RNA sequence: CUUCACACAUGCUACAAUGGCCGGUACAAAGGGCUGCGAUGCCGCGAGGUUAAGCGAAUCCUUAAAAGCCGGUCUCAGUUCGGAUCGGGGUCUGCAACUCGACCCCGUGAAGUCGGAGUCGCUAGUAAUCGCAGAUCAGCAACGCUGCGGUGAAUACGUUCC
RNA sequence: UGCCUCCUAAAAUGUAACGGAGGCGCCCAAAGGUUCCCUCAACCUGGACGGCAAUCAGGUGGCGAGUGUAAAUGCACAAG
């Protein structure tokens, strides 16, 4: 049942549906669920198209979601890059930017070991 | 009847004379061929176009495609001359018209995050191709019976001599540019 | 242009035929010339390149003739039978002119095989 | 044999399997799990029902009573003897391929004569 | 080869969820197709950091 | 003193169903506190903010122990497992949080499916696991160290081999 | 060491050398016959994955592609 252009998998909980829209994580899908009036514990398979039609609108008002927050993330990153802050010189190589340790480990920023 | 033709010659017809001075009325651009294909290039490989992009555009467009082989034979690309590797419709007259509505009206807005389609792609002809996502925003096709999601790309060919006259042909079908 | 693609790609296979079958004062070819209105066929002898014969839907005897084009066709076809056959001709090869036979002309060849010319 | 992808726990679950094509009963309140990594062997004498078992978990036949469940994990390979086969007057080559150079045997890629030749069919 | 070759195109009614409706032809089985968005009710067919500072802080 | 193609070492969190999450609900011990502990009430989704009772303490505060019990839900999936990385928005302490602080919220949701050769601890309230407190300290990189109690096992024929 | 093609070969044919370059000891049940239809390569503009180049659309393009197989004579009227 498409929502937002994110093809919500069928048979799975609709607490735990809308968490796969990029966006809305567990916090949200309590409160998108509570506006409206539908009930946690029903499944995504019986979901009525004027149910879906009272969260088309309040997530579209009130949230942000696919493309337009994934714009604002990688310009974000965009942003540091070109004014020359420690971060943008830290996001061009890699390298880990809240201060983490990057004697030991910080393995997600890097790739695997290369062992030189 | 077809509701996109019988609105071409109500008002795009004597709207094309206003805006550019036409002597004779045999001069008004209109829309001659919409061309439709897949073009799989992923079937140099494991063979399945059959059930690929045939029963698919069948469903989309209307009518059976044209399996095309090819040309040459590229190394680099791993195919050999006469193999199938591109999957052609091609849609004239009633269908066309009943096409390039059942595109604007339900489909056009289901690709995601949609924003519109850039004016510049142009051939300097006055003939207009753009390119979608996948098997998502036409309807016919269903999201849970399809194989593997496969794009295509469009055609629109029109009868008029320079780019901007066929910007305003295709602006009056409903075609969001931006 | 799909009018000059027409007239282009009908003398080219008008030539096609052509290196294979001319016609002569014995055998005169009977060229066929098929428009959306009308149809006209002449016989033309390729020796002087002289035309001994011809019809057409154009005069008078034909336009009157009830019924839908392929009506017309049969009576072109059966006066170019008896006007051949004034002028001491009987058999004829047969000139496509570029077109499929069917429909049209092969109601005028067909029209003129049971009225004296021997194809 | 070419590896295929990560199996996972589920591989095929049956749970109380009916199958007849009359008033004959083939499979009767037959319940299993098939395990992950070994080999089941299948037993039993002519006319009872053995080639009626693959052809409910490949889904070519369907149960009357009870459910076959698979696992998102589990991609099958079976073909039948009497469906499609083989084709009397292709050839050899063009059964294993369809005409073409290269072949999917899953996620890689490899050419046909040289999958072909790897059974057996070599040279000309 | 215009002789049962193509799918089924016959006459078929479409509706939206804006309440707009109209009717074309298409192979989609029992001509009832039902769309959430059209050419209607979808957007774009009908439409600093120096101010995020002064909201945090002010002007000085 | 915190750098980073890498290499080793001691840990913590994991890979799930003897589990996750949601609602209810029972049982500690040892400690700290006037340049402090902040009850209660109100405001804040929360970290906190404000007002201020009581206490140099078996009196008042720190103090709701968590595993456990009962009920519901998920149904074996890189998932309602895992919570790394990163984006945005806040609090507090301090003259000051960019290099370099912890905490909170919202979003993102990486490797990981029990680990090669080899190696380590432990013989009973032990091991395994669950929390709580102290010292240093404005705050804190506290998963460390020194302590505290909760639940609570398996085996030991025997002295050939290491 | 026999057979096919070109230069040597001196504008018909022919012409030698342990002169200069290559092929052949097949293949095709259609790649044979016939009727009918079509025009290529390269380049340029536009286009989901798509890149110099897959497939599509439009311009320009008279032979620069192609010919089961060497090379010559030919073939766009096509013998493609
Ligand atoms: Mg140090
Ligand atoms: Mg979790
Ligand atoms: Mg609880
Ligand atoms: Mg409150
Ligand atoms: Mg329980
Ligand atoms: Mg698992
Ligand atoms: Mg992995
Ligand atoms: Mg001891
Ligand atoms: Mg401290
Ligand atoms: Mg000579
Ligand atoms: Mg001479
Ligand atoms: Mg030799
Ligand atoms: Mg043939
Ligand atoms: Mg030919
Ligand atoms: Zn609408």
């Given at each position: 049942?498409?929502?937002?252009?994110?093809?919500?998998?069928?048979?799975?909980?609709?607490?735990?549906?809308?968490?796969?829209?990029?966006?809305?994580?567990?916090?949200?899908?309590?409160?998108?669920?509570?506006?409206?009036?539908?009930?946690?514990?029903?499944?995504?398979?019986?979901?009525?198209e004027e149910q879906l039609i009272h969260l088309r609108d309040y997530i579209e008002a009130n949230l942000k979601v696919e493309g337009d927050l994934r714009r604002?993330?990688?310009?974000?990153?965009?942003?540091?890059?070109?004014?020359?802050?420690?971060?943008?010189?830290?996001?061009?190589?890699?390298?880990?930017?809240?201060?983490?340790?990057?004697?030991?480990?910080?393995?997600?920023?890097?790739?695997?070991?290369?062992?030189? | 009847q077809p509701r996109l033709k019988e609105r071409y010659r109500s008002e795009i017809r004597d709207a094309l004379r206003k805006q550019f001075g036409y002597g004779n009325v045999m001069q008004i651009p209109t829309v001659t061929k919409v061309v439709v294909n897949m073009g799989v290039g992923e079937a140099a490989r494991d063979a399945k176009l059959i059930?690929?992009?045939?029963?698919?555009?069948?469903?989309?467009?209307?009518?059976?495609?044209?399996?095309?082989?090819?040309?040459?034979?590229?190394a680099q690309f791993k195919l050999r001359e006469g193999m199938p590797v591109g999957?052609?419709?091609?849609?004239?007259?009633?269908?066309?018209?009943?096409?390039?509505?059942?595109?604007?009206?339900?489909?056009?807005?289901?690709?995601?995050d949609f924003r519109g389609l850039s004016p510049k792609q142009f051939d300097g002809v006055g003939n207009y191709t753009f390119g979608?996502?996948?098997?998502?925003?036409?309807?016919?096709?269903?999201?849970?019976?399809?194989?593997?999601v496969r794009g295509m790309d469009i055609n629109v060919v029109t009868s008029a001599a320079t780019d901007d006259e066929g910007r305003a042909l295709l602006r009056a079908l409903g075609f969001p540019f931006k | 242009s799909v009018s000059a693609t027409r007239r282009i790609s009908r003398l080219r296979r008008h030539t096609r035929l052509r290196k294979k079958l001319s016609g002569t004062a014995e055998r005169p070819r009977l060229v066929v010339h098929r428009s959306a209105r009308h149809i006209h066929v002449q016989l033309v002898n390729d020796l002087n390149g002289t035309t001994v014969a011809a019809a057409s839907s154009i005069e008078a005897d034909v336009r009157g003739v009830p019924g839908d084009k392929k009506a017309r066709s049969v009576r072109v076809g059966?006066?170019?039978?008896?006007?051949?056959?004034?002028?001491?001709?009987?058999?004829?090869?047969?000139?496509?002119?570029?077109?499929?036979?069917?429909?049209?002309?092969?109601?005028?060849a067909d029209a003129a095989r049971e009225n004296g010319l021997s194809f | 044999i070419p590896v295929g992808p990560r199996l996972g726990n589920v591989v095929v679950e049956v749970d109380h399997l009916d199958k007849g094509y009359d008033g004959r009963a083939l499979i009767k309140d037959?319940?299993?799990?098939?395990?992950?990594?070994?080999?089941?062997?299948?037993?039993?004498?002519?006319?009872?029902?053995?080639?009626?078992?693959?052809?409910?978990?490949?889904?070519?036949?369907?149960?009357?009573?009870?459910?076959?469940?698979?696992?998102?994990?589990?991609?099958?390979?079976?073909?039948?003897?009497?469906?499609?086969?083989?084709?009397?007057?292709?050839?050899?080559?063009?059964?294993?391929?369809?005409?073409?150079?290269?072949?999917?045997?899953?996620?890689?890629?490899?050419?046909?004569?040289?999958?072909?030749?790897?059974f057996g069919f070599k040279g000309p | 080869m215009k002789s049962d070759i193509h799918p089924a195109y016959e006459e078929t009614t479409?509706?939206?969820?804006?309440?707009?409706?109209?009717?074309?032809?298409?192979?989609?089985?029992?001509?009832?197709?039902?769309?959430?968005?059209?050419?209607?009710?979808?957007?774009?067919?009908?439409?600093?950091?120096?101010?995020?500072?002064?909201?945090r802080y002010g002007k000085r």
């Open positions: 049942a498409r929502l937002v252009g994110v093809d919500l998998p069928r048979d799975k909980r609709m607490e735990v549906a809308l968490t796969y829209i990029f966006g809305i994580g567990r916090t949200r899908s309590n409160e998108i669920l509570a506006a409206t009036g539908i009930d946690r514990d029903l499944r995504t398979r019986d979901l009525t604002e993330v990688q310009a974000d990153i965009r942003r540091k890059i070109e004014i020359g802050c420690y971060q943008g010189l830290r996001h061009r190589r890699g390298m880990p930017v809240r201060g983490q340790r990057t004697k030991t480990n910080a393995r997600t920023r890097k790739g695997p070991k290369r062992t030189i | 059930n690929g992009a045939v029963n698919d555009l069948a469903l989309i467009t209307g009518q059976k495609p044209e399996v095309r082989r090819a040309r040459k034979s590229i999957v052609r419709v091609t849609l004239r007259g009633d269908r066309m018209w009943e096409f390039l509505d059942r595109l604007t009206s339900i489909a056009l807005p289901r690709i995601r979608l996502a996948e098997q998502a925003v036409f309807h016919e096709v269903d999201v849970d019976k399809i194989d593997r | 059966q006066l170019i039978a008896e006007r051949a056959k004034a002028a001491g001709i009987d058999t004829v090869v047969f000139d496509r002119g570029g077109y499929t036979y069917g429909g049209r002309i092969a109601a005028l | 037959l319940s299993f799990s098939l395990p992950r990594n070994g080999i089941v062997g299948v037993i039993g004498p002519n006319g009872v029902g053995k080639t009626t078992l693959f052809k409910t978990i490949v889904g070519l036949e369907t149960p009357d009573s009870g459910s076959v469940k698979v696992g998102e994990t589990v991609k099958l390979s079976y073909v039948d003897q009497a469906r499609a086969g083989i084709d009397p007057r292709k050839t050899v080559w063009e059964v294993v391929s369809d005409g073409l150079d290269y072949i999917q045997v899953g996620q890689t890629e490899v050419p046909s004569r040289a999958y072909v030749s790897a | 479409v509706v939206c969820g804006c309440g707009n409706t109209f009717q074309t032809r298409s192979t989609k089985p029992g001509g009832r197709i039902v769309v959430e968005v059209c050419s209607q009710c979808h957007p774009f067919y009908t439409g600093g950091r120096v101010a995020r500072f002064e909201k």
